[PDB]
Design a protein around this ligand. Structure first.
Ligand code: SF4
Ligand SMILES: [Zn+2]
Ligand SMILES: [Zn+2]
Lengths: 444, 434, 481
């Protein structure tokens, strides 16, 4: 009937929208569960193997987390750039003096090019704040809560004027081994919910996704949340006749049973929009009980943000729309000269965390102790997965290939999902050799 | 928890809900305060004292002889409660001494309850060795025990069990040559055994409290336990329960006779000062108004009462409205609670806002010197012996026990049957006596 | 050394308390003692006696008298207003007018507000008794409220001035700032523009557009030349005069911000609806409550709303039972709408689902981390926790001398969750009524096993959130470590 009528009458069915890497045949397929497939969570003290501890916050401890982050980034940047020595923010120095601190918006609104303050660290500036003037600065790209070293001149001690910004240095890549190069090419599927149109519960997009998974027989499939969106009008009005947990269990069991024949490994990444799960960031892995031996072997539940390795390739998984949040509150010298996505991804890779913006967007809850101990980048990931409301894309920045597949369903219109081959190349030769080979964002 | 008595020297490491934490702390504070008051009023050995403390322990479900319920709930409650109170009381030396005294009284009582047949295992379970001699050995050495025995009259060596203990553990006992020794082991009766047990327990408790006092700064950081543990004893009331919202039928005219028949001394003298002077300072006005609200005076009745008294003050009734009716209605009404919404308690009256010149509020026992206490008691027509014992209790800083004795005197009864902690409870019990 | 110092200081505090005095403040460098004495010589001899007894208790401690205050209003460390008693010859003394920490940081106050603040501070620093001071202040506040309400006050006194640090268009929060709104209006409609460093004058007005006050800020001459709109008296009473006076009067015992609102006008209802309930709480209470009761515990907690699926009528669930006396009926037995015959007990699922959403929202609201400055005059409302910190808490970036604290405290959220579980805790609610035969008849007539299971499920829907709830349980291992 009328519900989800567009999905039954969409012409773009199965038509690839974007390609990256090398030209590849339309008949994308893998070997399925056959062959040696490695799938291991990595780094960052195990990234919430268990559920959680608390929803109780302490201001001094949040302060400790923030200052520790600032000081760690500062030590790394100082040792890399061979900076002589930092100075207190409030010290009036006639000669240009390097200053360390995190950027912040003066008021509670969107950051403006002349409404920016620098907040220092305790061990150098005692956490003092000082306005910064960007009139003299030529090229810059800032957002709230990013750690920066600014070499401006401050002759009065009450207002700094910027003169140069130090591009932050990314983490070293993941050093492979002989076993990693011993892996043949494997195809990876990645899709992000919601899996039903804005006015439906039939979950037709999920059925189409299951069909394509079965047909292609990919090696590993990443499914981001939400699986029953909290913002869905059906649940926002609490018209459902079944508990949230029951509906989520039904959807998960349908997904699991649908892909039994494919033999493809399956991983579920939670999202903040999941109504039933805990609404806090970072999120622990989903909970499920009805698992057989084969199902338990084929399905893994991972936390979010998660940094898992498939066949020795570091994947950066984050379900929250980080790109949109950063773009909302990011300022830069030039807009059309460079791509916004490029510099936002640059910031994500540089800041060494899975959510560098601070304070986060209103529709987001971050537990800062668990975030500090579980949501830090271990190494510049080989591939970064950031499903975002922004348009789908596949960029290659600082070596890392960042893919935004896009939401699987926009309102009532069709969405897109990303396939990508992955093959660790020769152990030696070119200095940088991205394991990713080809990427195809394709319409569902 | 092998035994009911136990020595508290192994802190628990479980997890409990915050509500359980607060309930345990409050229950144990109530038990300790009851122990103190009951020991002060009565004698520590009379069957009345033991029975009353038994009833208190049963109602607070803190200890009992071994059974299914005792294994799980009362013993763990006692353990965690004792350690929470350790956290609460290690702040000051006076608090430490008070806690030690009352814990010693409680331990002595519990020991007296404990049947003899089990004491042995308790001593074994206490982790220090005391050995009981055999009947044959007791018969053989009865003459020696009697000869070495203290001034205890006669040769009667009754059924009291005799134990074999190293002389080291009876230093203060055998140092006076008042006990028999054999191969370095001393033979002691039950009373001296319990004395030794309590002495060692006191030493252990003192050391533990000193350590907790040193360790406090680490644990005081928590914000959801500071307001509870800081004033657990100093300024926390043991379930006054005489809160705002009571019901009753009080006639405004009758107030006067009630004041001379069923009011505690604080409210009695505050009412007399009001009637005689037609005016009260801020503190006394608030205290008495809150008390009248507590006893059952409705808002219109209270407004009429205060207005009628203030017409005699020679000031404009419209001025009365605009000035004080707002305050009275706010007291009877909306937010600002815990200072205006709630009637005061004996503890708050004693410990807060000492009266000054021209101010008649406060507990008379705590805030007026003995000469004026005697004057007031004489004016209240109480027997001289009653006045003497009231003054004795006041000198012992047991003001509430003194008020309890005053209640018994004026009501011409022997035992009041409760433990006053709130003036409105005083009035309610008096009305119950009619 | 610090431990011994704290020990001796606490002992001195308790001892001087035993001396029938009361100590109001002290940190290892000073002790303010309230003497309850109006005789200077008596105070001096009492100070000498306490010094002598503490000295003979601690031989080498050399205490001394630093100063005497005839009357003092205490608000915080180095925050007070006092009449310093400078002793002159022949025992006479001069009441030098001193006060620290009363400085106001922002200059966006009406002339009338400044006058009211000056009057209040002068009255409090007068030598007359507490009752007379309170009576004078109340009379003046009532007179000012009536004068403003009836329009007798000159409009010129309602004018407000505020400087412009940046250009009007460069303020990120231009929506919420009245002065930048007026700057934009004058720049657009008028001629000469307003630049950084200039001062803009504005007066709030009532347009009837149900907008925020900041959006209604109008120029003074614009108001004088327009008649369709008038001055917003309610705004001026709520957050232009109440802040200044309550910053000083609130600490006084027996007077509360609610009482000031009642004196000033018809705010009380909408005020306590729009009132901050943070500084009111203070554990200083010397023996008041033990653990309160459910009535006063869950008073601030938001009640559980729910739409009836059949009719859509709103239902409020503020307790397990509803009615009075004989008709103690479960709130789920019948829909709040008399016309609707659908028992909510049928729609438990929806209920549970809604409950989830509600608690979910609250969690997010708690994690927004909105910090508010405590000084009523500033009341800066930010979300970026400042690294700069004070002894008690975060330092206000606007008030370099103040303390931020959460808008939605963690314990507020804990109380909300406990209220949610209590609303459906049928078993416990069955133990609060004394009349046993009433319990028997009521439970046999409604509390069948099915409804018990439904209520238990509703309990669990919030108990599963409470189990992982942030030190709602205390770990003894850490405590006794
Ligand atoms: S003990 Fe309580 S009731 Fe008795 S006089 Fe003192 S305050 Fe009043
Ligand atoms: Zn209905
Ligand atoms: Zn402030």
């Amino acid at each position: 009937a009328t519900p989800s009528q567009k999905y039954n009458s969409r012409s773009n069915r199965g038509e690839v929208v974007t390609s990256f890497g090398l030209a590849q045949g339309v008949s994308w397929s893998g070997r399925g569960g056959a062959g040696n497939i490695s799938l291991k969570v990595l780094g960052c003290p195990e990234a919430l193997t268990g559920s959680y501890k608390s929803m109780f916050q302490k201001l001094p401890d949040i302060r400790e987390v923030l200052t520790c982050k600032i000081e760690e980034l500062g030590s790394e940047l100082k040792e890399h750039y061979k900076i002589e020595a930092f100075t207190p923010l409030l010290a009036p120095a006639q000669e240009p003096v390097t200053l360390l601190g995190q950027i912040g918006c003066d008021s509670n609104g969107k950051l403006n090019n002349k409404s920016v303050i620098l907040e220092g660290d305790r061990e150098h500036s005692s956490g003092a704040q000082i306005p910064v003037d960007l009139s003299e600065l030529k090229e810059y790209s800032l957002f709230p809560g990013q750690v920066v070293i600014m070499e401006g001149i401050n002759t009065t001690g009450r207002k700094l004027v910027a003169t140069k910004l130090y591009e932050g240095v990314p983490l070293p890549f993941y050093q492979p081994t002989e076993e990693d190069a011993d892996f043949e090419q494997s195809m990876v599927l990645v899709a992000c919910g919601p899996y039903t149109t804005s006015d439906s519960i039939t979950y037709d997009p999920l059925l189409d996704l299951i069909a394509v998974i079965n047909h292609d027989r990919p090696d590993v499939c990443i499914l981001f949340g939400p699986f029953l969106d909290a913002k869905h009008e059906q649940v926002e009005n609490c018209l459902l006749t079944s508990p949230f947990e029951d509906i989520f269990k039904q959807c998960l069991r349908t997904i699991i049973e649908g892909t039994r024949s494919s033999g493809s490994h399956l991983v579920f990444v939670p999202s903040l929009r999941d109504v039933h799960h805990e609404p806090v960031y970072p999120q622990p892995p989903f909970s499920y009980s009805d698992l057989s031996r084969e199902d338990k072997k084929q399905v893994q539940f991972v936390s979010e943000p998660c940094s898992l390795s498939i066949n020795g390739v570091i994947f950066g998984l984050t379900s929250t729309d980080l790109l949109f949040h950063l773009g909302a509150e990011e300022i830069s010298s030039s807009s059309g000269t460079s791509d916004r996505f490029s510099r936002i991804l640059k910031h994500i890779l540089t800041q060494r965390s899975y959510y560098p913006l601070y304070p986060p967007q209103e529709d987001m809850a971050i537990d800062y102790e668990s975030f500090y101990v579980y949501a830090q980048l271990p190494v510049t990931p080989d591939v970064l997965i950031i499903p975002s409301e922004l348009r789908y894309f596949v960029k290659d920045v600082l070596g890392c290939v960042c893919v935004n597949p896009g939401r699987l369903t926009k309102g009532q219109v069709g969405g897109t999902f990303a396939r990508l081959y992955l093959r660790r190349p020769a152990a030696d030769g070119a200095e940088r050799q991205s394991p990713c080979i080809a990427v195809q964002v394709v319409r569902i | 928890y092998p035994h009911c008595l136990q020595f508290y020297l192994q802190p628990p490491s479980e997890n409990i809900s915050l509500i359980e934490f607060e309930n345990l702390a409050i229950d144990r504070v109530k038990l300790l305060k009851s122990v103190e008051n009951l020991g002060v009023s009565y004698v520590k050995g009379t069957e009345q004292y033991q029975s009353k403390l038994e009833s208190e322990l049963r109602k607070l479900k803190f200890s009992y002889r071994e059974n299914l319920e005792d294994e799980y709930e009362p013993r763990r409650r006692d353990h965690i409660s004792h350690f929470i109170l350790r956290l609460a009381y290690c702040q000051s030396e006076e608090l430490r001494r008070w806690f030690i005294q009352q814990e010693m009284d409680l331990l002595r009582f519990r020991f007296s309850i404990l049947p003899k047949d089990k004491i042995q295992d308790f001593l074994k379970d206490s982790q220090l060795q005391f050995e009981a001699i055999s009947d044959e050995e007791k018969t053989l050495r009865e003459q020696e025990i009697v000869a070495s025995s203290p001034s205890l009259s006669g040769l009667k060596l009754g059924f009291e069990s005799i134990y074999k203990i190293p002389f080291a553990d009876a230093l203060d006992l055998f140092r006076g040559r008042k006990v028999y020794l054999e191969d370095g082991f001393a033979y002691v009766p039950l009373k001296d055994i319990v004395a030794i047990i309590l002495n060692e327990f006191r030493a252990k408790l003192s050391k533990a409290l000193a350590l907790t006092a040193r360790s406090l700064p680490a644990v005081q950081s928590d914000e959801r336990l500071q307001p509870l543990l800081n004033h657990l004893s100093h300024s926390y009331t043991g379930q006054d329960y005489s809160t705002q919202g009571n019901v009753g039928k009080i006639s405004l005219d009758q107030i006067d006779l009630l004041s001379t028949k069923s009011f505690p001394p604080c409210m009695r003298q505050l009412h007399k000062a009001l009637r005689e002077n037609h005016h009260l300072r801020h503190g006394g006005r608030m205290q008495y108004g809150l008390f009248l609200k507590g006893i059952g005076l409705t808002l219109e009745q209270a407004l009429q009462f205060w207005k009628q008294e203030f017409i005699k003050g020679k000031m404009d009734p419209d001025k009365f409205d605009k000035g004080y009716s707002y305050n009275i209605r706010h007291s009877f009404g909306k937010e600002g609670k815990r200072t205006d919404y709630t009637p005061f308690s004996c503890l708050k009256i004693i410990l807060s806002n000492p009266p000054s010149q021209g101010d008649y509020h406060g507990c008379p026992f705590r805030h007026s010197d003995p000469e004026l206490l005697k004057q007031k008691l004489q004016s209240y027509k109480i027997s001289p012996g009653g006045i003497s014992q009231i003054l004795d209790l006041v000198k012992g800083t047991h003001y509430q026990v003194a008020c309890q004795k005053y209640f018994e005197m004026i009501h011409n009864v022997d035992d009041c049957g409760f433990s006053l902690n709130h003036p409105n409870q005083f009035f309610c019990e008096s009305q119950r006596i009619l | 050394v610090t431990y011994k110092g704290r020990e001796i200081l606490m002992h001195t505090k308790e001892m001087v308390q035993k001396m029938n005095l009361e100590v109001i403040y002290g940190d290892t460098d000073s002790i303010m003692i309230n003497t309850n004495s109006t005789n200077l010589e008596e105070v001096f001899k009492l100070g000498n006696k306490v010094k002598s007894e503490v000295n003979k208790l601690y031989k080498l401690l050399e205490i001394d008298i630093d100063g005497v205050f005839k009357s003092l209003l205490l608000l915080k460390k180095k925050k007070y207003a006092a009449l310093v008693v400078e002793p002159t010859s022949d025992g006479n003394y001069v009441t030098k007018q001193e006060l620290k920490g009363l400085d106001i940081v922002r200059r966006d106050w009406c002339d009338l507000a400044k006058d009211t603040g000056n009057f209040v501070i002068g009255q409090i620093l007068s030598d007359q008794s507490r009752d007379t001071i309170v009576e004078n202040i109340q009379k003046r506040l009532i007179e000012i409220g009536e004068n403003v309400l009836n329009g007798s006050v000159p409009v010129s006194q309602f004018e407000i001035n505020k400087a412009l640090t940046k250009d009007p268009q460069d303020y990120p929060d231009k929506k919420s700032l009245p002065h930048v709104h007026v700057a934009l209006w004058i720049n657009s409609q008028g001629g000469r523009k307003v630049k950084a460093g200039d001062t803009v004058s504005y007066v709030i007005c009532q347009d009837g557009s149900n907008l925020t006050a900041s959006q209604r800020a109008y120029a003074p001459e614009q108001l004088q030349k327009q008649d369709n709109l008038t001055i917003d008296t309610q705004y001026y009473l709520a957050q232009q005069i109440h802040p200044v006076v309550a910053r000083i009067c609130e600490p006084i015992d027996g007077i509360d911000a609610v009482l000031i609102a009642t004196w000033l006008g018809l705010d009380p209802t909408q005020f306590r609806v729009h009132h901050y309930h943070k500084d009111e709480e203070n554990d200083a209470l010397l023996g008041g409550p033990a653990q309160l009761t459910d009535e006063e515990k869950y008073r601030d907690c938001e009640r559980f709303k729910c739409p009836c699926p059949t009719c859509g009528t709103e239902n409020i669930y503020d307790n397990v039972f509803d009615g009075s006396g004989t008709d103690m009926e479960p709130s789920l037995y019948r829909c709040s709408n008399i016309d609707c015959k659908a028992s909510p007990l049928t729609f438990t699922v929806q209920l549970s689902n809604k409950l989830i959403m509600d608690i979910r929202r609250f969690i997010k609201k708690y994690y927004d981390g909105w910090l508010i400055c405590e000084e009523p005059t500033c009341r800066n409302r930010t979300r970026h926790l400042p690294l700069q910190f004070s002894r008690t808490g975060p330092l206000c970036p606007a008030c370099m001398k103040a303390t931020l604290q959460p808008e939605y405290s963690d314990k507020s959220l804990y109380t909300q969750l406990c209220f949610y579980r209590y609303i459906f805790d049928a078993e416990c609610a069955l133990e609060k009524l004394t009349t046993d035969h009433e319990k028997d008849k009521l439970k046999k007539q409604f509390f069948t096993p099915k409804v018990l299971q439904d209520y238990r499920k509703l309990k669990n829907t919030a108990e599963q959130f409470l189990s992982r709830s942030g030190y709602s349980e205390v770990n003894l291992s850490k405590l006794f470590a």
